[PDB]
Amino acid sequence: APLQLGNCSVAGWILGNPECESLISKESWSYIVETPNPENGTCYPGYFADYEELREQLSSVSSFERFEIFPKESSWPNHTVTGVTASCSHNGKSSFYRNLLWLTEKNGLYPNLSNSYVNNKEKEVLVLWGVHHPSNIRDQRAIYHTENAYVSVVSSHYSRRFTPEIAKRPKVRGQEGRINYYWTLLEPGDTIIFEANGNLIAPWYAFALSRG
Amino acid sequence: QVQLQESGPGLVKPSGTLSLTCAISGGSISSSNWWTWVRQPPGKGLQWIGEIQHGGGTNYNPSLKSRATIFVDVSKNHFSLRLSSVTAADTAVYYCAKVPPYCTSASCPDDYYYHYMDVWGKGTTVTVSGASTKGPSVFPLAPSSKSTSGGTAALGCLVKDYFPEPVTVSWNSGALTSGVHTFPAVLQSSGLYSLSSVVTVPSSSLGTQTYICNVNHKPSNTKVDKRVEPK
Amino acid sequence: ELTQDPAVSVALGQTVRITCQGDSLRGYSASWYQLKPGQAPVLVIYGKNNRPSGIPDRFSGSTSGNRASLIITGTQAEDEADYYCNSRDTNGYRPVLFGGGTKLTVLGQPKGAPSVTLFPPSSEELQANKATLVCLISDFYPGAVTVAWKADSSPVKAGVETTTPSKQSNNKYAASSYLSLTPEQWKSHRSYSCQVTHEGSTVEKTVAPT
Numbered sequence: 001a002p003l004q005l006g007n008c009s010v011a012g013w014i015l016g017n018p019e020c021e022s023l024i025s026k027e028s029w030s031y032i033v034e035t036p037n038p039e040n041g042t043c044y045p046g047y048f049a050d051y052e053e054l055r056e057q058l059s060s061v062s063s064f065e066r067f068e069i070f071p072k073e074s075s076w077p078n079h080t081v082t083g084v085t086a087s088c089s090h091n092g093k094s095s096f097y098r099n100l101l102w103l104t105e106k107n108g109l110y111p112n113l114s115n116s117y118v119n120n121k122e123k124e125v126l127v128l129w130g131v132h133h134p135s136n137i138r139d140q141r142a143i144y145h146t147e148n149a150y151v152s153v154v155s156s157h158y159s160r161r162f163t164p165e166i167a168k169r170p171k172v173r174g175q176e177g178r179i180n181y182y183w184t185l186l187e188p189g190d191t192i193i194f195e196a197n198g199n200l201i202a203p204w205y206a207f208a209l210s211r212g
Numbered sequence: 213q214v215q216l217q218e219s220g221p222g223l224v225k226p227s228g229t230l231s232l233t234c235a236i237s238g239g240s241i242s243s244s245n246w247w248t249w250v251r252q253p254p255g256k257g258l259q260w261i262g263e264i265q266h267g268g269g270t271n272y273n274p275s276l277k278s279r280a281t282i283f284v285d286v287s288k289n290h291f292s293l294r295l296s297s298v299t300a301a302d303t304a305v306y307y308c309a310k311v312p313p314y315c316t317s318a319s320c321p322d323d324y325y326y327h328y329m330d331v332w333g334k335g336t337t338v339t340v341s342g343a344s345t346k347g348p349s350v351f352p353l354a355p356s357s358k359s360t361s362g363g364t365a366a367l368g369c370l371v372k373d374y375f376p377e378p379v380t381v382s383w384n385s386g387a388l389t390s391g392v393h394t395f396p397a398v399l400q401s402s403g404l405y406s407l408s409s410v411v412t413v414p415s416s417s418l419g420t421q422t423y424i425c426n427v428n429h430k431p432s433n434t435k436v437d438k439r440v441e442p443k
Numbered sequence: 444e445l446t447q448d449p450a451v452s453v454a455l456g457q458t459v460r461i462t463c464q465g466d467s468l469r470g471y472s473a474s475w476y477q478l479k480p481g482q483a484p485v486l487v488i489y490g491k492n493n494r495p496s497g498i499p500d501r502f503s504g505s506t507s508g509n510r511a512s513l514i515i516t517g518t519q520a521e522d523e524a525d526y527y528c529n530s531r532d533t534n535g536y537r538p539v540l541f542g543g544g545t546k547l548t549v550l551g552q553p554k555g556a557p558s559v560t561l562f563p564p565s566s567e568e569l570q571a572n573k574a575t576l577v578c579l580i581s582d583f584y585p586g587a588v589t590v591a592w593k594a595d596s597s598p599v600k601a602g603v604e605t606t607t608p609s610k611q612s613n614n615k616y617a618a619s620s621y622l623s624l625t626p627e628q629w630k631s632h633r634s635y636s637c638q639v640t641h642e643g644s645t646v647e648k649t650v651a652p653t
């Protein structure tokens with residue numbers, strides 16, 4: 001039996017686009033029924049890294065399961081986790097991806113953050129995150145205290161450091177900022193660690209699955 | 213849980229320089245916040261003075277600007293305001309306050325497009341005058357056998373001839389709060405202020421319970437604890 | 444510029460709207476602050492009808508074009524205060540702007556006759572060769588009252604100072620009057636009197652140097 005994604009791409013479904021009313025997922029499927037969409041499924045404009053690879057690796061799964069990798073109200077205590085934007089509306093109210101969190105300053109401060117997850121699900125864990133890019137420098141200072149920020153995601157098989165790019169842009173969906181989306185597969189027992197002093201679109205919910 | 217506290221002289225000579233400082237607790241001055249000064253002249257509304265962001269520069273009310281300078285000091289974790297060439301028009305209650313960061317482009321979550329002043333200090337009073345400071349004289353307003361309301365009796369404190377404003381009065385070191393009213397001050401033709409503070413107490417307690425009013429005149433570094441006993 | 448009107452009345456328990464007009468209201472929208480005498484301003488409404496913690500739900504806010512409105516349903520006596528709209532300009536150096544302020548009065552409140560206590564000059568003040576008669580007026584509503592002093596039975600206007608009525612913590616009003624005398628005048632008369640007229644009727648208290 002297929003995974004019925006209805007009106008939604010796999011991008012918007014896997015990231016948790018608010019407008020995807022599409023049914024919460026099954027435990028397995030042999031293929032995916034989806035609507036390709038011009039604007040991907042990214043309610044906030046940006047670039048989805050390795051989208052083609054993720055699409056074919058999600059074509060057939062065995063033990064799919066969505067779970068809360070970093071609880072919203074405990075993982076980021078002295079950051080702000082309640083950011084919403086008009087470009088990701090839900091029933092006419094501003095919202096955000098249901099699988100990610102837009103971390104910004106709290107009380108004018110964005111302290112160095114660090115968090116780690118150990119894959120005890122006895123299967124591969126699909127972690128997704130984003131990197132945000134303001135359009136001017138003073139706005140990078142507003143929401144993140146730091147001007148030259150960094151994001152570092154490392155596991156035993158994955159390691160990359162991200163730096164924001166501040167540039168004037170055209171408005172896509174009324175927005176001049178950008179969020180680039182990234183993902184990796186965590187093998188059982190492996191640890192993934194997130195480090196940043198700004199611009200991280202932190203993972204909130206992740207997925208455990210078995211391809212095939 | 214950021215909290216602010218103004219401090220500075222309550223009296224400035226005409227054409228002198230006003231100098232105030234706002235102490236910050238539960239937060240850091242090295243932030244993206246807009247540390248803000250606001251004042252209220254007597255009988256007038258709120259007036260924006262200026263703002264500063266650490267690493268982001270300053271922004272002033274054009275009506276001032278020439279005489280107003282706002283700066284920070286990360287070491288002592290406070291920001292300050294200096295207003296030169298003061299006149300009677302600069303007499304006001306000055307407030308420090310915190311304005312959270314805001315965004316200028318379509319790159320941030322929605323809350324960074326709202327302006328509001330999140331935290332406020334309690335305000336400090338600055339009067340511009342050439343007259344000299346004067347501490348107050350405190351006299352009892354003792355209750356008498358005619359001055360009673362049955363089970364209730366009114367007693368008070370007369371705070372006389374002080375300058376400048378303000379004066380605050382508590383009773384029994386703050387242990388007595390219910391039924392307390394401190395009146396606004398009168399300005400006499402001598403230029404000196406006077407006010408009263410009254411508290412209603414059980415008249416059956418007049419011979420037993422001790423009653424002391426605590427007068428505070430920070431604009432002369434004076435505290436007076438005045439015992440009030442029956443006539 | 445940012446304009447609001449300086450006074451508005453509402454009957455106790457009814458609904459009041461306090462509107463503020465200005466082109467800066469488009470953009471960073473409006474903030475509202477409750478200002479009470481001797482207290483720091485309190486932010487009550489900001490954003491799209493956002494309320495800080497500790498503010499009753501009776502408060503609400505909405506913005507039209509260049510008009511923003513603070514709404515108080517079931518207005519209580521505690522809500523009497525000055526209310527200022529506040530915004531940040533988007534053009535130029537983006538200054539912060541304040542409205543002129545609106546004074547909110549609450550009506551249909553219970554009427555109360557003034558409680559008057561007249562204190563003679565204290566023995567300590569007389570020994571300092573001064574003499575102040577202190578007349579404290581309290582617990583009256585509405586907050587309008589006229590004071591008059593008498594030496595014996597003749598009116599006295601020299602050396603009189605009276606404050607403007609001010610709210611107590613129980614939402615009733617209080618006021619004070621002072622008559623300054625020399626100790627020689629104080630003892631030279633048989634009595635002095637504080638006359639307090641409130642809503643047509645008068646309470647008089649009398650002290651005697653004997």
Ligand SMILES: *[C@@H]1O[C@H](CO)[C@@H](O)[C@H](O)[C@H]1NC(C)=O
Nearest residue numbers: 076077078079106111238239
């Ligand atoms: C964040 O760090 C500061 C600094 O120690 C601390 O005071 C604050 O309590 C932390 N946040 C939370 C939610 O505890």
